[PDB]
């Protein structure tokens, strides 16, 4: 049981490390911003109606 | 070269907008990155203007 | 956890210049095609002047 | 056990020595500075808006 607990913890840390590190980078890190769509100007113009 | 020039002069405005969208979130570390993307586009666009006027 | 910050900054500083290189290569390949078109033209104009059909 | 502990300590020191020494040099040693990006002037200009 003690030996098999340690394998689980090695799997978990391996998975989290890659996903955390893949969370960096401009394309993802900007995708988290709401106004990233680039059409904010014509939305503001439409809001004039 | 006239087609290429019109692409880069509008790709730069995309990155200029995306920079201001970062400063309003205070994320200067990301705004500087977008500005660096803009710079190299403006530099190569000046090369097309020089090339095109000569051609 | 000092090494991991150092690596994580180095990793961002690489892709930042893959972006720069990939925009420059487009402008350089454009220039390489234009230069080579003018070379073939100037070669053609010289060969025509060497025949001097108008002088014959 | 005593003989095999000493091999581990030789591996560890060999790995740390190379990585520590590779930590020197201008390109890395400047990459640790936040304003290293070189666009600080146009950022300050943008901050005028």
From Swiss-Prot, chains A, D:
Domain of life of the organism encoding this protein: Bacteria
Location in or out of the cell: Cell inner membrane
Effect of gene knockout: Essential, it cannot be completely disrupted. Cells with very low levels of protein have no ordered thylakoids, are barely green and are non-photosynthetic.
UniProt family annotation: Belongs to the PspA/Vipp/IM30 family.
Function: Required for thylakoid formation.
Entry protein name: Membrane-associated protein Vipp1
Taxonomic source organism: Synechocystis sp. (strain ATCC 27184 / PCC 6803 / Kazusa)
Upper lineage: Bacteria, Bacillati, Cyanobacteriota, Cyanophyceae, Synechococcales
């Amino acid at each position: 049981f003690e030996r098999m607990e340690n394998k689980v913890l090695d799997m978990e840390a391996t998975s989290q490390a890659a996903g955390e590190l893949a969370g960096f980078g401009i394309e993802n890190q900007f995708a988290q911003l709401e106004a990233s769509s680039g059409v904010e100007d014509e939305l503001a113009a439409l809001k004039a109606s | 070269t006239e087609q290429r020039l019109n692409q880069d002069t509008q790709e730069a405005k995309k990155w200029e907008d995306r920079a201001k969208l970062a400063l309003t979130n205070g994320e200067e570390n990301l705004a500087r990155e977008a500005l660096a993307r803009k710079k190299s586009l403006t530099d190569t666009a000046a090369a097309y203007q020089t090339q095109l006027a000569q051609q | 956890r000092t090494m991991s910050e150092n690596l994580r900054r180095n990793l961002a500083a690489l892709e930042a210049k893959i972006s720069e290189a990939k925009t420059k290569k487009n402008m350089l390949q454009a220039r390489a095609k234009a230069a080579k078109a003018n070379a073939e033209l100037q070669q053609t104009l010289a060969a025509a002047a060497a025949a001097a059909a108008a002088a014959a």
